[PDB]
Amino acid sequence: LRKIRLGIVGCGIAARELHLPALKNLSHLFEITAVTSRTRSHAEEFAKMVGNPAVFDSYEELLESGLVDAVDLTLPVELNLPFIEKALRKGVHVICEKPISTDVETGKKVVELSEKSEKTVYIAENFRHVPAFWKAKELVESGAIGDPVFMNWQIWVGMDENNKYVHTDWRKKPKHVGGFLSDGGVHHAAAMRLILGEIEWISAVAKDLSPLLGGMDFLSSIFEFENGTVGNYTISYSLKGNERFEITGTKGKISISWDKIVLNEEEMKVPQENSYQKEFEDFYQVVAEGKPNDLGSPVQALKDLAFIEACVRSAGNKVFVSSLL
Amino acid sequence: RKIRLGIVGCGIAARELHLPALKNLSHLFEITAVTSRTRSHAEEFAKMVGNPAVFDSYEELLESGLVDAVDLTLPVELNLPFIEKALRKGVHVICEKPISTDVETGKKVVELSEKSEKTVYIAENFRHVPAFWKAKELVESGAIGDPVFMNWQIWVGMDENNKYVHTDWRKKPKHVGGFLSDGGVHHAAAMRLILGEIEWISAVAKDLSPLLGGMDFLSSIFEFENGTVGNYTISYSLKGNERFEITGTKGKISISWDKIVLNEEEMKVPQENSYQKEFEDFYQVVAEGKPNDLGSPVQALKDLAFIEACVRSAGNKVFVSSLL
Ligand SMILES: NC(=O)c1ccc[n+]([C@@H]2O[C@H](COP(=O)([O-])OP(=O)(O)OC[C@H]3O[C@@H](n4cnc5c(N)ncnc54)[C@H](OP(=O)(O)O)[C@@H]3O)[C@@H](O)[C@H]2O)c1
Ligand SMILES: NC(=O)c1ccc[n+]([C@@H]2O[C@H](COP(=O)([O-])OP(=O)(O)OC[C@H]3O[C@@H](n4cnc5c(N)ncnc54)[C@H](OP(=O)(O)O)[C@@H]3O)[C@@H](O)[C@H]2O)c1
Ligand code: NA
Ligand code: NA
DSSP, X not given: OOOEEEEEEOOSHIIIIIIHHHHHTTTTTEEEEEEEOSSHHHHHHHHHHHSSOEEESOHHHHHHSSOOSEXXXXXXXXXXXXXXXXXXXXXOEEEEESSSSSSHHHHHHHXXXXXXXXXXXXXXXXXGGOHXXXXXXXXXXXXXXSSEXXXXXXXXXXXXXXXXXXXXXXXXXXXXXXXHHHHHHHHHHHHHHHHHOOEEEEEEEEEOOOTTSSSOOEEEEEEEETTSOEEEEEXXXXXXXXXXXXXXXXXXXXXXXXXXXXXXXXXXXXXXXXXXXXXXXXXXXXXXXXXXXXXXXXXXXXXHHHHHHHHHHHTTSOEEGGGGO | OOEEEEEEOOSHIIIIIIHHHHHTTTTTEEEEEEEOSXXXXXXXXXXXXXXXXXXXXXXXXXXXXXXXXXXXXXXGGGHHHHHHHXXXXXXXXXXXXXXXXXXXXXXXXXXXXXXXXXXXEEEOGGGGOHHHHHHHHHHHTTTTSSEEEEEEEEEBOOOTTOSGGGOHXXXXXXXXXXHHHHHHHHHHHHHXXXXXXXXXXXXXXXXXXXXXXXXXXXEEEEEETTSOEEEEEEESSOBOOOEEEEEESSOEEEEETTEEEETTEEEEOOOOOHHHHHHHHHHHHHTTOOOOSSSOHHHHHHHHHHHHHHHHHTTSOEEGGGGO
């Protein structure tokens, strides 16, 4: 099995804590041969965790070095577009973190570069690879609750001053639509779309409740899927509480968690998996083994972002999600 | 002295909800007159009361000189005309919710109320439920900090065995949104009592059950004038568990008939009959000069208006005041 020579770009939290451990479990598929960051010492610390990749002062040099088949971008979202374009111009595949971009108009440019290039652009939306969501999808699609009627997802993150993501520069002064609403919201849209399909319209109210979190941090919404199912999605990044994620149909109900699905009275444990690992496997198959790009698809990520961007601008008015696309 | 009260409409609410309450308030109410669409139902109800006078028609009961006030437990389409007839004879009216079939018609009830010296009390019993009062005081006293988000999810799960489902004026509803306004006005009342007036709603209404006349599912988002966001979702046909939660900057309450949970801590709510409480209030209004804060038609119109807005919405933003 030939390996994908991979360059890591942006050696921050995701790269160290989320990407590397997954990558370390996939060394039969990937070799990290190059590394670059804004702060050189950060790239050097990352190099040591990896082994001995070449360290570059700039991404453009990494791209031209001949050392890589693809690059992994774990950057401030403002950088996705120009950096994806640089990679494709050099004939290099890209796996890039969500959100696809800072907003939908910029996102669309990522999509068109993707569609015009022969190289793969893969937006790493790990919620598309979470088994609990797949299992919910299967239950729903096979008629286990009858016709889906209503879903509610309430999320209370309770981030405080000790949360590491809160202190990063590009989150404190967000350039992305809705601040934390897009940052974490694309995950939630990904999941709802996986389980129930495309959303037709939303109506939502977004608030900025914490001076600690850059931009908006509270969102409450109703929407309707194209299939007629009604959704409620409410989240506070700053306040505490218990997640509920429930789908009620004509014949019964499911509740969804990381570790289990409950179908009426019946518990089913979901065997645990690393979704980052799962997405890297999928990217490998897209790049090397000619698998279609369904789950890392730029178009999919753009649709995730569109849901959130619609909510941010709704101010309680009905927004048809298509009109953003 | 005691309020001479005539019962009009001897159906479910009259036998099962109203009479027991009055039987505990025999020192404040005497039932003297009774009338219904079916004379035999009125005669059965009379036998349950003692020996009141049975009348073939509302109009006759009103001219009989036997009552100071009437209690209307009727198809909602009849509220406006029956209230008007009573006020035009010098007779107080206690009338069941909803105030009317729709806001346009409701306003006519409000208008007649303000012009008469007699009381019109819309018996919205949810304004008399102690669980909501204790929740109000906790929120008002700053127990959870600034209120951020309330969520009320109701799954009534009505079936063929529920008696309300077989009543004619519910099967072919004339009232806005069918069951949505029938049960919804209660919920608006509780929401308004706890968090105050609502600025705007956005809502979707479905008709999911062939058994329930009219629309029977509703999901909505809205914002109180104080800034709190609300979600209110109800199905009248499907089963699930009620949650009623209000989250603030400092804490969390969860509300139930018998208890309020403040963060980790439970406080039992002492139980009461809300019908019994509302009749006492009506007694205090007509005999004791108590201002009509809790049974006032204006409050009942605002309840209906919340629900009417939600039915018109189709997902669009509706500013409630625009209906009033
Ligand atoms: N899927 C998920 O569960 C998830 C979770 C968290 C984050 N993410 C995504 O991962 C990406 C990074 O997030 P993060 O939390 O890791 O934030 P972060 O810690 O701030 O990481 C960003 C990294 O990029 C570096 N960088 C900034 N500008 C650069 C430039 N011009 N050229 C090269 N490197 C540059 C930063 O600078 P320094 O060199 O100075 O350190 C830092 O190393 C984001 O797109 C985010 O949405 C995804
Ligand atoms: N606050 C609450 O918790 C609550 C609960 C239930 C009901 N309610 C309200 O109370 C009212 C009564 O509802 P319900 O459940 O008791 O329904 P119901 O059983 O159908 O009661 C209506 C009664 O009025 C009679 N009636 C119909 N037209 C009449 C007319 N023209 N003249 C005299 N009587 C007439 C009916 O027919 P017959 O004489 O042939 O029997 C029946 O006895 C409704 O407005 C409802 O919204 C409130
Ligand atoms: Na904020
Ligand atoms: Na129905």
